[PDB]
Design a protein around this ligand. Sequence first.
Ligand SMILES: Nc1ncnc2c1ncn2[C@@H]1O[C@H](CSCC[C@H](N)C(=O)O)[C@@H](O)[C@H]1O
Ligand SMILES: Cc1cn([C@H]2C[C@H](O)[C@@H](COP(=O)(O)O)O2)c(=O)[nH]c1=O
Ligand SMILES: [Zn+2]
Length: 403
Amino acid sequence: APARCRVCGDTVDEFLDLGRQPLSDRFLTPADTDGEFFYRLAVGRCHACGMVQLTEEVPRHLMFHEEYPYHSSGSSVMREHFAMVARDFLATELTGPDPFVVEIGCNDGIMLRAVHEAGVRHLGFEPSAGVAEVARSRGVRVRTEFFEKATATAVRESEGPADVIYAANTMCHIPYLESVFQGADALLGPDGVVVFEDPYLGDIVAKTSFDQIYDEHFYLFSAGSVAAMAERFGFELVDVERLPVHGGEVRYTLARRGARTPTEAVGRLLAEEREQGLDDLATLRTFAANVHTVRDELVALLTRLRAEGHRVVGYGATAKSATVTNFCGIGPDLVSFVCDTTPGKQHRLTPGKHLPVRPAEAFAPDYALLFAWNHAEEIMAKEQEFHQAGGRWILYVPEVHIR
Ligand SMILES: Nc1ncnc2c1ncn2[C@@H]1O[C@H](CSCC[C@H](N)C(=O)O)[C@@H](O)[C@H]1O
Ligand SMILES: Cc1cn([C@H]2C[C@H](O)[C@@H](COP(=O)(O)O)O2)c(=O)[nH]c1=O
Ligand SMILES: [Zn+2]
């Protein structure tokens, strides 16, 4: 029997079943292995409001806790991006004599750092206690708390109204959006905005990039779903922008209903989504057929390659890759190990399928399976050596192909 929509409570129509999955970032020490968590990863569309979402939630505190392993400042290009975000806010929203910006999911303080440094009052919400502490050491004010209604309301009471509430790669992790927006209601000034950027459903379908579907991406936002969501909560979609990062995102700007005028980009994106059928169950079924084809093809290839004695190695032990390995039944018998630059992932086995993770230097095989497809260019150039040697790259986004 079907899931209830986490926004409006109506029935969700499941369109893709990705099977039993581990938590995407629980890399196993061989010393433990035993009590590995699995859940059923599948995706559906609310029948009333069209919000695309997972049909089983992972409990928030099993993902967001004291050992949260994703550190934002690992990425130089993401450090640059969030500096730019900070500068953009200071030029446009945080222009007053004593403004205030709240960030949901501030992580190691990669964006709020630049706001603090501009002398602007701020507060991060970061429930993962470890990274929260990194943000604090860097001067950012942080509450080690989940942003929701009550926690947002107590910040209003002690610190006054916010001009901006920002969330980057965070809103799609939070099923309880109503509580989030009751929080925003309490906390924003009359003209304030909620601004969030997350993986975009349009790019997922166009690219068949189904490895964007894993535990921490409860929602696959579009302009259409976000607009309806907003409307339900007394908000309004007033700006949108497409971002190239993390495989394709949109940054959505909401204000309170009737408070701001929507930009021409909003209507434009809404019409694009409409003519492309992005709101149709039927389109999402085509996507799921395309995903099955990718699986069929990727498996057939890897098995052909093993029968012919070609060694295959994985490149990039991405959080996304968990979905591909578990969905495709790819274990050590089809890919011997995965090269990764993160030392907290090395000396360990990948979530669910338990591929050994070895350092980058281990790379120098006949074929390399490129899991970090969103950094393909960078990777293939760094490793020209390999492909000069007759090495070949198997990619599965947007299709199974070799290069
Ligand atoms: N209700 C909530 N309020 C605030 N942060 C939350 C939350 N639920 C999850 N998070 C946090 O959201 C983050 C998702 S990862 C995002 C960090 C990233 N570089 C960025 O773009 O901000 C984690 O650090 C996690 O602890
Ligand atoms: C770009 C790159 C990423 N990786 C891995 C590290 C991370 O685990 C992951 C990509 O992180 P991102 O999604 O935050 O950009 O891929 C490598 O091992 N080598 C590389 O050259
Ligand atoms: Zn709904």
